[PDB]
Structures are given as structure tokens and as C-alpha cells.
Paper text:
The conserved shelterin complex caps chromosome ends to protect telomeres and regulate telomere replication. In fission yeast Schizosaccharomyces pombe, shelterin consists of telomeric single- and double-stranded DNA-binding modules Pot1-Tpz1 and Taz1-Rap1 connected by Poz1, and a specific component Ccq1. Here, we report the crystal structures of Pot1DBD-single-stranded-DNA, Pot1372-555-Tpz1185-212 and Tpz1425-470-Ccq1123-439 complexes and propose an integrated model depicting the assembly mechanism of the shelterin complex at telomeres. Overall, our findings provide valuable structural information regarding interactions within fission yeast shelterin complex at 3’ ss telomeric overhang.
Consistent with previous Co-IP data, our biochemical analysis using purified proteins showed that a short and highly conserved fragment of Tpz1 (residues 185–212) is sufficient to maintain a stable interaction with Pot1372-555. We crystallized the Pot1372-555-Tpz1PIM complex and determined its structure by single-wavelength anomalous dispersion (SAD) method at a resolution of 2.6 Å. The crystal structure reveals that Pot1372-555 adopts a typical OB-fold architecture containing a highly curved five-stranded β-barrel, hereafter referred to as Pot1OB3. In the Pot1OB3-Tpz1PIM complex, the Tpz1PIM polypeptide exhibits an extended conformation with three separated helices (H1, H2 and H3). Helices H1 and H2 of Tpz1PIM lie in a continuous groove on the concaved side of the Pot1OB3, whereas helix H3 sits on a positively charged surface on the other side of Pot1OB3. The formation of the binary complex buries a total of ~1,200 Å2 solvent exposed surface area at the interface. The N-terminal 310 helix H1 of Tpz1PIM and its peripheral residues fit into a hydrophobic depression formed by strands β1, β2 and β3 of Pot1OB3. The short H2 helix fits into a narrow cleft formed by a two-stranded β1’- β2 protrusion and the long loop between strands β4 and β5 of Pot1OB3, with the sidechain of Cys198 pointing into the deep hydrophobic groove. In contrast to helices H1 and H2, helix H3 and its peripheral residues are away from the major binding groove of Pot1OB3, attaching to a rather flat surface of Pot1OB3 formed by strands β1, β4, and β5 through both electrostatic and hydrophobic contacts. Consistent with the crystal structure, single amino-acid substitution of Pot1-Leu441, Pot1-pro451, Pot1-Ile453 or Tpz1-Leu193 at the H1-binding interface, or Tpz1-Cys198, Tpz1-Ile200 or Tpz1-Pro201 at the H2-binding interface with positively charged arginine residue completely abolished the interaction between Pot1OB3 and Tpz1PIM.
Numbering used by the authors:
A (entry chain A): 372 to 395, 400 to 531, 539 to 555
B (entry chain B): 185 to 212
The structure:
């Protein structure tokens, strides 16, 4: 599990735990560190990686990476707004209507290639073939990198299904 | 596990409440 030179993390004192530990004494906000591989993502079109926040045309980054740890368990990690900008780490790649920006979409693809390798290609391959996108993960080797996540419960009883995780302090280089 | 975020995702879910944000910010 040798991490890519292509992903740098912010200076932090958090130590390495596992996704198994995260899921298995109260439910307050937590801050974890993981050594991880991307196994899936949402949404399936990179064209939809930025959404409209404020009309008429103000967009923000919003997507999720399904990540997998040494302990063979997955976690959906949300990259939103400034944290997603941190990851993308590119002046020329900005939130907008991506369908209207083919060149920038290609640039996004190329940048995200550095964190998930041929995952996107394979996911799209399966969609066109009429097969499940989850097949893609086992087709390819995706790179390893350290990731920071902030655990929290947004306002949408109160169970674990109600927790969300958000990536941060992680940049593609 | 079949996670919700792998089918649907909204801006609601991405917003960290101000109180929880403060806890994370201080511990940093």
C-alpha cells in the first residue's frame, strides 16, 4: 500500500485508523485519517460534478468517492465546495456548468485520473455495456493515498445512517 | 454495504451545522 506522489496531505497530528474502526462513546463530530483506494464515485457523469447552488449560474463542487481501506470496508467520502477545490488543486478547473465546458471536463478527468486511475473509464465502459458500475473496481488497480475525513451529522430518532463524512486537507499534485 | 450517497446526493447532506463546525475547528 505504497501511496502516490500525486496526493499530498495538509500538516496534521491525526493518526492512521481504519474504516472498520470508524463504523464498528457518543455521536459527536470526529476527525480521522485513512490510507485508502477509490472504488466507486457519484455522480457517474463528471459532467455533473458541479451543481447549481445560487441562481442564475453559480455552481459548486459536489461529488462523493467510495473509498476502501486495508480492512475491506467502504466509506462514502463527500468532496464539497472548498474541500473539493483543495483536492482538484487547479486554477483552471472551476465549478460551472460542466456540460457547457467540454475542455474543462477533460481537464477534470485528467486530474482525477491521478487518484482513481482507470476507474472512470471502466465505470463508463460498464454503463455502455449495460452492466453494473461496481464491476469496475475489480477490473483495475486504483492508487493508494492518505485521506482526512470529518465526520458529522447534517440537518436533513438519530442513528448511524445519519452520519456523513467529508474529505479535506488533501490535494492532487 | 449499499450506501445512500452512491445513488443520490444533495446539498443538504454536505452542510456541516455551525455548532459541529466549531467543535472541529477548535480541536484543529
Amino acid at each position: 500500500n505504497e501511496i502516490t506522489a500525486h496526493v499530498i496531505n495538509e500538516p496534521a497530528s491525526l493518526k492512521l485508523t481504519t474504516i472498520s474502526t470508524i463504523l464498528h462513546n457518543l455521536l459527536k463530530p470526529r476527525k480521522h485519517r485513512l490510507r485508502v483506494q477509490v472504488v466507486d464515485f457519484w455522480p457517474k457523469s463528471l459532467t455533473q460534478f458541479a451543481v447549481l447552488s445560487q441562481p442564475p449560474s453559480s455552481y459548486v463542487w459536489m461529488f462523493a468517492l467510495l473509498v476502501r481501506d486495508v480492512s475491506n470496508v467502504t466509506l462514502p467520502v463527500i468532496f464539497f465546495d472548498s474541500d473539493a477545490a483543495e483536492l482538484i488543486n487547479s486554477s483552471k478547473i472551476q465549478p460551472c456548468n460542466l456540460a457547457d465546458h467540454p475542455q474543462m471536463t477533460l481537464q477534470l478527468k485528467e486530474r482525477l485520473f491521478l487518484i482513481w486511475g482507470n476507474l472512470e473509464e471502466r465505470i463508463q465502459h460498464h454503463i455502455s455495456k449495460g452492466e453494473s458500475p461496481t464491476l469496475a473496481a475489480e477490473d483495475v488497480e486504483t492508487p493508494w493515498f492518505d485521506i482526512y475525513v470529518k465526520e458529522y451529522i447534517p440537518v436533513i430518532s438519530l442513528t448511524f445512517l445519519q452520519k456523513r463524512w467529508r474529505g479535506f486537507g488533501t490535494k492532487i499534485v | 454495504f449499499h450506501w445512500k450517497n452512491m445513488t443520490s446526493l444533495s446539498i443538504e447532506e454536505c452542510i456541516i451545522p455551525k455548532g459541529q463546525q466549531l467543535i472541529l475547528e477548535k480541536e484543529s
